[PDB]
Assembly symmetry: C2
Homo-oligomer: 230 residues x 2
Amino acid sequence: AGKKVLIVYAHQEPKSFNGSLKNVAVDELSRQGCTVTVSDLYAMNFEPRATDKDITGTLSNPEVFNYGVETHEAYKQRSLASDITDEQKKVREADLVIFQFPLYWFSVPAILKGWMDRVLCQGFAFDIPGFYDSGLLQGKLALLSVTTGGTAEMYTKTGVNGDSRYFLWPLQHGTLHFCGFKVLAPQISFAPEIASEEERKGMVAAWSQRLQTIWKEEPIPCTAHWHFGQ
Amino acid sequence: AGKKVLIVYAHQEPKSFNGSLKNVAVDELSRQGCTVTVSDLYAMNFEPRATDKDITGTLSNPEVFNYGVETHEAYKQRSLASDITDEQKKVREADLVIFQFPLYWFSVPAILKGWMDRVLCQGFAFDIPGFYDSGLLQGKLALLSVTTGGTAEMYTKTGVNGDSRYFLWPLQHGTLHFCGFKVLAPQISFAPEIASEEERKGMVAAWSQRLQTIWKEEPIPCTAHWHFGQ
Ligand SMILES: Cc1cc2nc3c(=O)[nH]c(=O)nc-3n(C[C@@H](O)[C@@H](O)[C@H](O)COP(=O)(O)OP(=O)(O)OC[C@@H]3O[C@H](n4cnc5c(N)ncnc54)[C@H](O)[C@@H]3O)c2cc1C
Ligand SMILES: Cc1cc2nc3c(=O)[nH]c(=O)nc-3n(C[C@H](O)[C@H](O)[C@H](O)COP(=O)(O)OP(=O)(O)OC[C@H]3O[C@@H](n4cnc5c(N)ncnc54)[C@H](O)[C@@H]3O)c2cc1C
Ligand SMILES: COc1ccc(OC)c2c1c(C)cc(=O)n2C
Ligand SMILES: COc1ccc(OC)c2c1c(C)cc(=O)n2C
Ligand SMILES: [Zn+2]
Ligand SMILES: [Zn+2]
């Protein structure tokens, strides 16, 4: 009574396991009466590159191009490309941002990396002052829902990939905490592709299940100690 | 000596501090007699999105598109888009791959993330099985030359950002080591925007200076302990 949720989704295939997970999040959150909006990056052909096209009108310095400066000023002067400001409006309205993506190289797919690079701009998402605990997005929740190719076992302290929390750091702390998000525990669906079709059926159901009480949840302590420590 | 180097460069502005580090690498390795190639990703308008456009033949499963499966097959059949195979030929021929980039959200800019997602495909850079010390690019070296907005002090274990090595993990270990590269110690040029003009000139010459004896360096132990301590 009531909540707004943005799902930033990065998978090429609607019939994929990621697509199922995005669709059960939409179904469950809509059923609870939440306002839901989805940014389907691939379907939108979302631009991942940080270029001077991201500024309309004229550059606060067309001699030397500096992306961060130009986008900081463009933001303040309402001169950012509309793909960007369409996304920032969705984020500004959201109480929760859920990112749904397969892990690509211990991180997000480039198209979703480009969303963070280009949407979470200085003045919108952070400022002096206003990072970490005081980043401009404080008040909001963010949650990573990741699928992997490697098994839970590979993702331990002394498994081949190291601990899941190791790759989460740049996303949870370096990006989401930096901006002021309180970060909920990641949802990780380990290795769907090596089934079973029913164990999959089941990982979907657990995600839906968890979305039922998502609003009761406590944020993780987003710390060096949480990700690396013991 | 008789060595081939590929620099993968990701900055929009030739007069930038990244541009200067890239040029000094080129000047110094060329002076040594090395064969040098640069992939200047922004200038190439390098495509970062992993889509079905990257395969030109009949898809192995056209009903449900799986980028990893379809590119693995495409690589074996030689039906990958030519921008990808152009980069693969550069990598295949290189003895050392240097990545030169500003840190973006604790990671590489999206356009370079897209290079890693699309160029390092299954069959070319790794196979399952055939990764980490068995990865397919064994015998090659890689090095990250990264510039930051944050100062060295901010990137320490007790600094706001955590230790600099924490954000290297997904790139050094999860991508480069996974593919079989031996990783040389990163070159991190801290906060050049803050540094004085002579400190900048000094950071440029420290890189040029290091490159004088690069072929004598040993790789780092690319393990959790090196990155996280403990
Ligand atoms: C989307 C985004 C995300 C970011 N995320 C992060 C992050 O997670 N962590 C973080 O720490 N930072 C982050 N930053 C900021 C940071 O990485 C960059 O600002 C960058 O590393 C600075 O490098 P540059 O080449 O652009 O510097 P420039 O601004 O080009 O360098 C300062 C310059 O010295 C220059 N110069 C060029 N050549 C020379 C030379 N030969 N001698 C002396 N001076 C020279 C220019 O004259 C200019 O004054 C982010 C920035 C953006 C836009
Ligand atoms: C460039 C790249 C880099 C990568 N890097 C990494 C990495 O660093 N680490 C790592 O661990 N992995 C990595 N991977 C592997 C990748 O993370 C996994 O392939 C991906 O997460 C699988 O998720 P998906 O949605 O694509 O699964 P899918 O293959 O689409 O689905 C698994 C199965 O579930 C089925 N399905 C669809 N809907 C449902 C439903 N409702 N219920 C049950 N089943 C359903 C599908 O049809 C399929 O049979 C990488 C892959 C690529 C292409
Ligand atoms: C390209 O990277 C991968 C592609 C496919 C994978 O499994 C299908 C990968 C991985 C990685 C990095 C780790 C990893 O554990 N797995 C399991
Ligand atoms: C978008 O992230 C940044 C943009 C600009 C920055 O400084 C110029 C940043 C940062 C971060 C994350 C850390 C950080 O320490 N700095 C210093
Ligand atoms: Zn944090
Ligand atoms: Zn390693």
